[PDB]
Design a protein around this nucleic acid. Structure first.
Lengths: 85, 43, 72, 97, 60
RNA sequence: UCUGAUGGAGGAUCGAGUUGAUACUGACGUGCAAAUCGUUCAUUUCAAUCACGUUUAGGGGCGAAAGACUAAUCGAAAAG
RNA sequence: GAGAACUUUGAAGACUGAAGUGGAGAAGGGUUUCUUGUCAACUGUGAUUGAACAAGAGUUAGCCGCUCCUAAGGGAUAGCU
RNA sequence: AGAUGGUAACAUAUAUAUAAAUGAACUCCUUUACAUAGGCUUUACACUCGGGGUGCGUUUUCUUUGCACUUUACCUUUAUAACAAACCUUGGAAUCAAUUUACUUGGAGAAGAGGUUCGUUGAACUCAAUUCAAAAAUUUGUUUUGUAGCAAUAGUAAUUCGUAAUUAUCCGAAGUGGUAAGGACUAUCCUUGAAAAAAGGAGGGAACGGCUUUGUGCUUUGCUACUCUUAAUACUUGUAUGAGCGUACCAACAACCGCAUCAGGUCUCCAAGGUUAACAGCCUCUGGUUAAAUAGAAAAAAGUAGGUAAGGGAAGUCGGCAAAAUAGAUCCGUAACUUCGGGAAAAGGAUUGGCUCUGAGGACAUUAAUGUUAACUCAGAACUGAAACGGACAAGGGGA
């Protein structure tokens, strides 16, 4: 059944640290532990290995990404301007 | 310890050899003695 | 220690200049089973014999230069 | 399967009684936890020097030694006698030393 | 007096020092023994035995 | 959205050991001991504990900071 | 044994209780090891005991370790002060 | 002038010994070589149960009984067998399927079927040799032997005999999960968890038979049984195997450091049984000990370390200091507040022994049907007792 009303994955922290701190760390651990879409194989199986490294479990190929998500909006826009030319 | 160096073992043997008493025939015509527990070699 | 099974190889190893002794072991099982073990420089080679007759012809048929060692 | 318990050497010295031993084994050996249900699956016969125990069920030869010690303790000769196996299927009363 | 023989008998019989029994009489013969050979021989002729281990039954 | 399992997270909990030292302001205080003993107590997945090696040396070091510690010596060691 | 509560033996009653006064090692010690003597002192009572004293003895490796490699790091070379 | 099998994964040298499958410069990799957590799993060792044998013990009475032994090293690429994985061939997946405790995986090729390899292990499996029948100018079934060789010759436990020898045994089936290691996994990190010696694999393709001979290492002439690899021997080579050092003992309990034969301190490994959640406590087997700078007697005060106390229950005291109070497990019940995670073992009730039973939870085969066999785990009921049962040990006081 539903085990926590709202704390989600931050239930591991119990009552320690502020609720705002726990909520902020939840909002990014959610995307840190997510599985992203591997554009090389098309299977959503790329997970973070270390802080900036993302490896696909299928291709075994790894890319440099954000600290907590496979891509970061700044670099996404940056690449897009280059591709426009 | 059981593990020793050659020089250390030779020194231990020398100390044992010097810890012996004065020969009786000599005494009929020693202070520098040690016990393993009382005074340590420190060497 | 190695175990050799066919008679041909065992005899060939016996005929080698290296081999020094043959160990004959006989023992009861339930019938006396035996085993002959050639002592070469590298390995001790053993063959077991259920057959009294084969075992009793083979040790004789072996040439007598190398020394006998009967353990029983 | 047949078991032999010899008493030739001691009963020659007339310290036991073969009929007494026979009766003890007849009324004391138990089958199916029952003491006198030998019937046709375990039988015991006598001899002027041996005791014969012919069994037809899974039977432990050590049981014979157990009862023999029990008997020679009841009649107080335990300090003098030992039960020593000789063959696969034979026990024998030996003196000490 | 018999500590050497006790130690040697324990070694020879492969049991504890607290488990070997010397004949309380005939201890002069035991004291005569000073080698594992002698200890072996008078163990063989019964002047030293190995006491049984204390019973630890699992019946209960 | 709810319920039952499964799962096995966390500077999570109890707790021996280890590592310490709350209280009795207990004993002892010509001690077993120039800091021990008893009971009690804190601590045990982590900023955890231990060993050896190695680096930092005196108006210097080292300090989750008490002027603490730096060989029973520290608001400036010890030796001459 | 001159002499035995604390030397040895046998018997008993118990203890340690595999987190052990049980087995193996390291650091440290250095002959305390072993056998035979043995008691002036020491072994805070005794002591014939002993890790004490005395005389002898005992440590065997191609395979266990060191030795080799490199680590935190140390020393030195070239310079330069 | 350098072998060969398989479609493939890959395999092949068994000579006493699987030694030789050409290969330079120059390169490129691999091994060495690495964290933590969690469970799952396999194996060995440990423990335990039953059977057989042998010995001992108990034996007023009971007891087909209680105890002990019943063993097997390294090495043989150990051969095989089995299994977690990875890979290959065929195959061609939605009604998606396979599958784990967990999730993991698939048109970048799943399931099914057939294989290859590594790694675990190390005689498993008829494994090896062997007996007996069907395949053909060598395969498949049935038996004997052997603890597979080591290996029984050793070890252990017994019975004897001059006092050094003979003898007999050393084999039938399982359960629990304690320790260790391995495996395949999953998870965590603003933490990603040595290096080198040393070894290996590969890419590349420099060099090239033998006897004799022209002339100047190069074209040449007649002839062919000819190169590498392991072992041994003989002679030359300086003497043509295996250096040096440590190795006793203690490791605290009197061998260390604390001025000592000091209740202190001081690193690592092994690790039995019972009860139990348990390497806890308590008792026990193996091993060890019965020793402590003393003994004997008496036994008042006082001290110290404890017990127990009628009635009251903090009036004591600065202060409940100290002690007492339950305290395990199961079932029930659980507030304010709250950062919604907690609070919480909140608070607070009930039950608990023994005995005799009842029910539930698995594995293994036969032609929808019937037998063989294993764990302790739960739930319920009768009975029983001086109403007692986490009986000792162990073990929160709670609340505002």
């Amino acid at each position: 059944s539903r085990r926590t009303k709202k704390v989600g994955l931050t239930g591991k922290y119990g009552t320690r640290y502020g609720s705002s701190l726990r909520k902020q760390i939840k909002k990014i651990e959610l995307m840190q532990h997510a599985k992203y879409l591997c554009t090389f194989c098309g299977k959503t199986a790329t997970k973070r290995t270390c802080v900036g490294i993302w490896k696909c479990k299928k291709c075994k190929r790894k890319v440099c990404g954000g600290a907590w998500s496979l891509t970061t909006p700044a670099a996404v826009a940056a690449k897009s301007t280059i591709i426009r030319l | 310890g059981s593990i020793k160096r050659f020089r250390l073992k030779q020194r231990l043997g020398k100390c044992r050899r010097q810890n012996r008493p004065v020969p009786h025939w000599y005494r009929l015509k020693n202070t520098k003695r040690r016990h393993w527990r009382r005074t340590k070699l420190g060497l | 220690p190695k175990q050799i099974t066919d008679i041909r190889k065992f005899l060939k190893i016996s005929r080698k200049p290296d081999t020094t002794a043959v160990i004959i072991m006989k023992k009861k099982s339930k019938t006396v089973i035996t085993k002959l073990k050639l002592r070469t420089k590298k390995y001790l080679y053993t063959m077991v014999f259920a057959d009294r007759k084969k075992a009793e012809r083979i040790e004789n048929s072996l040439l007598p230069s190398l020394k006998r060692i009967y353990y029983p | 399967i047949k078991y032999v318990l010899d008493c030739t050497k001691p009963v020659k010295d007339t310290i036991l009684d073969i009929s007494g031993l026979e009766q003890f084994f007849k009324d004391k050996i138990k089958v199916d936890k029952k003491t006198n249900n030998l019937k046709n699956k375990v039988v015991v016969t006598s001899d002027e020097y041996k005791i014969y125990i012919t069994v037809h069920i899974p039977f432990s030869k050590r049981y014979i030694k157990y009862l023999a010690k029990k008997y020679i303790k009841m009649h107080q000769i335990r300090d003098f006698l030992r039960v020593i196996a000789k063959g696969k299927l034979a026990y024998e009363f030996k003196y000490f030393q | 007096s018999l500590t050497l023989q006790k130690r040697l008998a324990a070694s020879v019989l492969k049991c504890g020092k607290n488990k070997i029994w010397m004949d309380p009489n005939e201890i002069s013969e035991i004291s005569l023994a000073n080698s594992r050979f002698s200890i072996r021989k008078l163990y063989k002729e019964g002047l030293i035995l190995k006491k049984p281990q204390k019973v630890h039954s699992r019946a209960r």
